[PDB]
Each structure stands twice: as C-alpha cells, then as structure tokens.
C-alpha cells in the first residue's frame, strides 16, 4: 500500500559446495538483486569462466537445433513442470552428451543437404536437357 517498501542490503555467507545449492534455492525463490562486488573482472577474473563457456556452447547448440526445427516447422509445446530443478553439475555432462547425439544427427542432415544440392544440380542439368529436346526444331 504505502509507497516506501524499505529495501536495505545484506551479506550472504556461503560455503564451497553449499554455495551452488543455496544459490539455486534462492534463484527459485527469486527475491534478490545481488549487486556486484568485484568490478575488475572483465570475464578474465570470472573464476567460473569454463562453466560460462560450456553454457555458451550449449546455448549455441540449442539455437542451431531450434532454428533447424523451425525450418522443419515443428511445435515447441513444452507445457508442464517447466521449472523442474536447477541443473546439477554431474547431469550437465549427460545432457551435453544427448545434445551431442542431436548434433551428430544434424551433421548427418547437413551431409544429406549437400547431396540434395548435388541432386539439384542434376535437376538443372535435366531441365537444360529438356530445353535441348526442343532445340532440335531450332536446328532445322
């Protein structure tokens, strides 16, 4: 009601491995801004840079798969239990393996597309041949 809603700041103590679980739980709760404390990072001092790189690679793989699916005109209906659970570190490897199998299928599809390009060149040759069947009248 009143337009004050005092915010105030706080410190969040953590642990080594407990930090991931606590942060995931808070993200599920989602009531904190987490103002940055280290400005001199520039990604180079991001500590978990490799995890961010893995996330970026997974995002690129997902984007490519989604673009291929949209080209295939396939719905993305995923209603139901959407926020299942924050991803644990160990299962990330299995998810990446499944995505790699999907990428292998996509690579097979790309090879098929190259073969289709060759077949389309053959079809263009066939059309030029169809024209040559009528050019015999022009030869006279």
């Amino acid at each position: 009601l009143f337009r004050s809603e005092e915010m105030t700041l706080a410190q969040l103590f953590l642990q080594s491995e407990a930090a991931y679980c606590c942060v995931s739980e808070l993200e599920e709760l989602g009531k904190v801004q987490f103002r940055d404390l280290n400005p001199d990072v520039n990604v180079f001092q991001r500590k978990f840079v490799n995890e961010v790189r893995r996330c970026e690679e997974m995002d690129r793989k997902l984007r490519f798969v989604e673009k291929e699916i949209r080209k295939a005109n396939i719905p993305i209906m995923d209603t139901g239990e959407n926020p299942e659970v924050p991803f644990p570190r160990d299962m990330i490897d299995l998810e990446a393996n499944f995505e790699k199998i999907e990428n292998e299928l996509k690579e097979i599809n790309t090879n098929q597309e190259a073969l289709k390009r060759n077949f389309l060149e053959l079809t263009e040759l066939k059309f030029i041949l169809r024209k040559t069947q009528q050019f015999f009248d022009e030869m006279a």
């Binding site: 915010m7 410190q11 969040l12 103590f13 407990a18 009531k31 991001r46």
Partner: protein, 491 residues
Amino acid sequence: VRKMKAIYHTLNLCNIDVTQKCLIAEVWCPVTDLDSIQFALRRGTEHSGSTVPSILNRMQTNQTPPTYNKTNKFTHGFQNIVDAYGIGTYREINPAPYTVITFPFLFAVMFGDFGHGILMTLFAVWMVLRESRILSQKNENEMFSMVFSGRYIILLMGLFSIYTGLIYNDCFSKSLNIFGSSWSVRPMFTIGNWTEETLLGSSVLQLNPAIPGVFGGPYPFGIDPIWNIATNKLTFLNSFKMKMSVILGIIHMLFGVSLSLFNHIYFKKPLNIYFGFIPEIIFMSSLFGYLVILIFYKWTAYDAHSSRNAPSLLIHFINMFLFSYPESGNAMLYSGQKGIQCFLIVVAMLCVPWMLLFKPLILRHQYLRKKFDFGDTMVHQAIHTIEYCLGCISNTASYLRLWALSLAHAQLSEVLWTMVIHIGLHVRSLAGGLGLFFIFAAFATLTVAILLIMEGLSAFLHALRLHWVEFQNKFYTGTGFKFLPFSFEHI
C-alpha cells in the same frame, strides 16, 4: 542452462574469501522477505552444509537501493504508465497510488459523449470477462498486448467518460432532456413584445431572437439541451470550457506541488522546506489562485440583466486582467482590487525569486565559522528557479491542451451526425429507411474509427503528457534502478 548461467553470473558477481571456502555476496532483499531468505539458509543448513547464514548489512555508504515498490495487483498497469520515468530515489516515490483517479489518466477523457463512454465500457468489460481465455490463448499483436495490459485503465476511463458525458449532457452530440430544461419562448416574446413572429420570424428575424426576459435557473445536473440546439452554443461552450480549464489546471498543479511538501518532510531537510518550496507555493498561489477567485467572483457576482451598458459583453474581464496589468484598465475596478493586485505582484514577482536564492551558503558561513562548492550549487539553484518560475506560466498555458480535444471531438461528432444521420432520416419512409442500414453501418464504422480509437488515442496520450510534464513533474524528481530478482523470466 539459463539457470546455470544465472547462477554462475551471480557467483562471478559474488566474492571469494581466502580465510575459508565461504563466499560473501551483497544481496538486495526486502525486509518482509528476509525470513524467507533465512528459509533458503534453512535449506542450506539441512542438506548442503550447515554454515550458510545471511546478515543484514546496515551501512550508509552508497547502497542506493532499487525501487522494488511496484508490488501490486492489476492496478500495476497504472504503475507501468508511471514507470515510463523510473522513479527510484528510495521511499520518496509518490506516484500512481496517490493519483489513480485524480490523475491525468482518468480525467483522460474530456470527450465523454455518453454513448462513447458506454461503448468503451462495453468493450473493456467484454474483454475483462474474456481475459482468462485471452491470456490462455496466444497473443494476436503487440498492440493487443498493450490493450491487454491496459484493460483495467480502459474500463475505468470508460466509466469516467460516461460520467463526463452525463455532466456535459452531449450524447452523440445530441443533448438529453431529463427533469426539465429551463428557458422558454412564450414569456420571452409575449412580455418582451417580440410576438407576431410566427411567419414574420421565418421571414424577417431569421436566427435573430436571443434575449433573456424573466428567466434563469440552471440545470440541476448539467447543461440545458437548449444550449445544444442553439447557435450561440460555440461562444458559451468556449467560455465555460476555458474557465473550467483554468480552475481544474490550477487546483491540479496546486495539489502536485503540495505533495512535494510531504515528500520533503519525509526526507528531513528543513532548510529546503522553509526556504525552497514555501516560495514556490506562495508565488503559485499569489499568481493563479487570484485568477481562480476572480473567475468565481465573475461567475457569482453578476446576472443576466447586469451587463455594463452593452447587451452581453460575454465575459469582458477574464483576459483584460493579464499577468502584469500595468495601469489604467478601467472597466471593472471594484474597491481594493488595485491594492490586492499590487500587493500580490510585489510579494510574488519581486520577493519570491529573491528569497529562492542563497541556500547552502547560509550554512557555509556557519561552516566557515566552524574552523561546499559554491559555484555549482548556486548555478544549479538558479537554473532550477528560472525553470520553475517560467514553467508555472508554461504549464498553465499547456493545461489548455485537452480542452482543444474536447471542442474538436464535440464538433467532429456534431458534423458527423449532421452529415450522415441527418441525411439518413428524411421523408418517403420507404426510401428513407430501405438504405438506412448502410448509412447507419457507415456511422458505426466512422464513430469507431475517428472518434473512439483515433481521437480516443489522442486524448489517451494527451493526458499522459499532462501527467509527465507538469502534473508529476512537481513532487517527484529523479531516477533509480528498477527491481531485478531471479524470476526465471525464460518461462
């Protein structure tokens, strides 16, 4: 992967200590949710570790808090229209909830045509009744998304448009006669010797007769329908709308400035309260409340048979009392008015700008006696003072805008009626009504297109501008970071 990326981004923002394996993260959380935050630690102390607490850090250096005050139900739509500026500045925020109705977004009609208000209310009510399936189903277009976000404001603005049409007594530019109409003609002509104009009035005095004899008495609710079916409608409506303009704008801007007094007493600062805003209110009152009181006095202290020598003179005193009125004037010079005018000019124009000066230097002297950049402080104060003193007049003039929309909408409705419906209703009933379906459908399409939406959108944004230039640019100033929790916005 989005959750993992957010977690690792936060960890990057978080800091790592060398004394232990623990991590310290600065957290912006509400006071009410603090317990829930502890509950998160309760999850931490249960499965993964046991030493993950959280402690309120109550310091004063920086720590500019986010707003996070935008916590409300459907009425949050109002906030979005206010959220075009990003209030911030902690608890100073005093935006929509104080205004809501008296805001320039519910008097955002000034076009109430009874029927137009009922149409807007019907559309918004049907849409609110269907909001369940509307949100359940896919969106149509971004404009539809904006209308869906605004449905509540649309409906309540429709109600206020209905009320404004009722008080204006202009239903589709055609007035409504309820519980009498005042005025008459037989008393005006028989007593006034203007009789024997049955056909002579249709031959000699075309559009001539306009005289009040033994008459008077206003409509108990609104404006008499006789003013609508007359031809001096333009002049009387113009004067009435301009005077309503002045009174409404002055009271609105007065309320806007008055809110700043509470805004500042909350944030201590007695020097500004006793030196910066008292001059503003004093000047604003002495220059505009006088005009309002003069308008009311002119309205009340005269009668039909009281015009000075000339028959009507309309008003003749609204504008000749300008913002300076150097000398002479003559006309209306009721005793004491010259003295009151001179006193108001000297207290307002000569004194208020002069005392609005100084400010922190007054403390600086004491500071200089104890053992701040004077230049920037005084130049910023000077620019703010000139901006406000010119902006009082500028916003008083700019408050006149919505009334132009009012007049234009009234004329558009009247001309549309007289050009389509007046043509559609005539003699030879069979021929006059066989095609009435097409003409009336054209009427419906035109009323929807140019009046309901086009002019409706014009007023919709006009009133928002009146909000954001003078209404709310009086009590709250500044910007601040909005809320930003981990809501998993990615579905």
